[PDB]
Amino acid sequence: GGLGLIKSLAEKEKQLLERLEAAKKEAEERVKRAEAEAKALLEEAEAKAKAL
Amino acid sequence: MIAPMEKLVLAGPKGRAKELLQSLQQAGVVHLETLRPEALSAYQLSPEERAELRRWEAVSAGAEHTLSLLGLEAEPARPFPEGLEAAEKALSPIQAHAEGLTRQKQELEEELALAQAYLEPLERLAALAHGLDKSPFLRVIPFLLTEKELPLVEEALRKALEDRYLLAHEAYAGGVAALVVVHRKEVDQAKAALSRAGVAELRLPGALGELPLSEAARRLKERAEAAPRELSEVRQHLAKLARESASTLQSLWTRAQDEVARLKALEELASGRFGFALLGYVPVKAKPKVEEALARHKESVVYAFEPVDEHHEADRIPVVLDNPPWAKPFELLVSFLNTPKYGTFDPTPVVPVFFPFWFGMIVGDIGYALLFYLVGRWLSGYVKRNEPLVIDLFALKLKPQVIGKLVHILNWMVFWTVVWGVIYGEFFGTFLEHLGVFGTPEHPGLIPILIHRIDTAKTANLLILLSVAFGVVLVFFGLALRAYLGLKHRHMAHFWEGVGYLGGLVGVLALAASYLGNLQAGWLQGLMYLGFGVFLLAVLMSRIWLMIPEIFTQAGHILSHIRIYAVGAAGGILAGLLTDVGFALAERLGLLGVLLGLLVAGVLHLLILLLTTLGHMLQPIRLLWVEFFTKFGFYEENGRPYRPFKSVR
Secondary structure, three states: OOHHHHHHHHHHHHHHHHHHHHHHHHHHHHHHHHHHHHHHHHHHHHHHHHHH | OOOOOOOEEEEHHHHHHHHHHHHHHHHHOOEEOOOOOOOOOOOOOOOOHHHHHHHHHHHHHHHHHHHHOOOOOOOOOOOOOHHHHHHHHHHHHHHHHHHHHHHHHHHHHHHHHHHHOOHHHHHHHHHHHOOOOOOOOOEEEEEHHHHOOOOHHHHHHHHHOOOOOEEEEEOOOEEEEEEOOOOOOOHHEEEEEEHHHOOOOOOOOOOOHHHHHHHHHHHHHHHHHHHHHHHHHHHHHHHHHHOOOHHHHHHHHHHHHHHHHHHOOOOOOOOOOOOEEEEEEHHHHHHHHHHHHHHOOOOOOOEEEEEOOOOOOOOOOOOOOOOOOOHHHHHHHHHOOOOOOOOOOOOOOOHHHHHHHHHHHOOHHHHHHHHHHHHHHHHHHHHHHOOOOOEEOOEEEEEEHHHHHHHHHHHHHHHEEEEHHHHHHOOOOOOOOOOOOOOOOOOOOOOOOOOOOOOOOHHHHHHHHHHHHHHHHHHHHHHHHHHHHHHHHHOOHHHHHHHHHHHHHHHHHHHHHHHHHOOOOOHHHHHHHHHHHHHHHHOOOOOOOOOOOHHHHHHHHHHHHHHHHHHHHHHHHHHHHHHHHHHHHOOOOOOOOHHHHHHHHHHHHHHHHHHHHHHHHHHHHHHHHHHHHHHHHOOOOOOOOOOOOOOOO
């Protein structure tokens, strides 16, 4: 089944291209969550400093 | 029978790709394939592996260049698994040694060859010019010239100062040392006029023609007294370098050829980013070896043992021979020509069933058979000694396995020439004269003869009919085989051409045997009916025209088998006449110069042996090659040669 083997390898290769683009979206999603939490922490710190 | 040649498809990850290609290349019984166009990339290999590849090829080229510089030849050995920079530390010092020595000694031979030819004229003019080495008033025009024509070149000095301007040739008559000395400009202009009469100054390379003659002659004496010592010492050191470097350098050469072969075959794959796939061809008697070799890998990565697609779209399939071992050693003799197409008939068994049996009918001398048995026992002793056969006259160097195949064909040939020396009844030409060992009724001494072969009233018609009959069997077998191969592939023009040539040829043969042979013109005429009816039916149901001029050459090919009896009678009565003249003129003229006639007939008999056994050895195999192989095809699209993963070893 050479045609089946080439078809299976193409199906593999495609599915993990989808895995690779899901990974590069998820890493940047973690980056956005981290920077949002950092800016919120800086804002809370300066608000506490000004209230004190 | 050509092996059925199944397909092998593999896949997986890429570090495992390099590892399984290593494990597949160690057990090298597989052919490769491109496998580009569908769903995968062309596999640009790697940049760092490209650098490693070109560095390995530089290693291989440098090692083989060092070896050819050393003077030996490059044979493989067993390789050694060791690191690459360890191979660099193995390669580079012996390369530096041999390269520095082949600079040193070759330029030493240049300086010695330019020195030894011109020591004595230079030393002679130095002893002549020891009153002016480099004095700043008069240049010394030197000319090592020809014989006594000194006035022809001294005419320029006669045009110069005649009562002065010392110019002569004293001694050393191998070349007359015409020295000229007047001044600077006077000697320059007189040298110009002497060159117009034919002259040249000693301006050579090195140190002689670039410095003053006294110290340059002393330096030439120094090089003449020094250089053969370095000749001998550098030969001794290159001999030591050979004897204790050639083994490890050709071992790393085998390693380098293995690495270059593996990496250059590594680009014949197809991959993207999470895996590869490759395709190859495996002969069916190699399936358990590849199966146990590919059983090693990761989770026994998935093989596809495809039964190969059939004769349609089948030109890219590799071909092997796979004959039984009684017929095995004629593969080179059938593979001087091209290769079949995996679906063409395996031609190799008919040459053992025919060719030595025809060569027996060529050579019917028991003495020729005994001399062949002597050279065969010599040549089997030569493969016992395991030496590659070398002769620089023909530049023939070849390995002992071909020589063992030559032993096999020579034995399987010499049996048939023994038995056709018995039936034809000829011992070393004719030594039945004194001892009447072969029984003809003109001098019956001993056991009878089957056919006399020296006369033609008893022999020629029977032998010529049998010589045509073998061609009848051969050509009808060939045309039937072409019809079989046309019936196989469902290609109909080959079937029609085969049955048409068969019908036309048997019709022409029946018409010949009837209307030009004997009486009884009744029975064979229906066979003429059948033959020409089949031929016309083939041409009508064919439309494959220009077979009609071929049938005349086809009868030519069935009739051109006369030559076996022709060279048989030629060589037979030639040997018989030579031993007849020698034996008769030795015995019945003198009775004690019989050894004179015996050895001159022997040396002339061995002369005609050495001078025409090549030709009447070549005749049966050209008979096969240009009748039988070209009847059933065998000359179409050249096939494709099976070369596996080498692992040169």
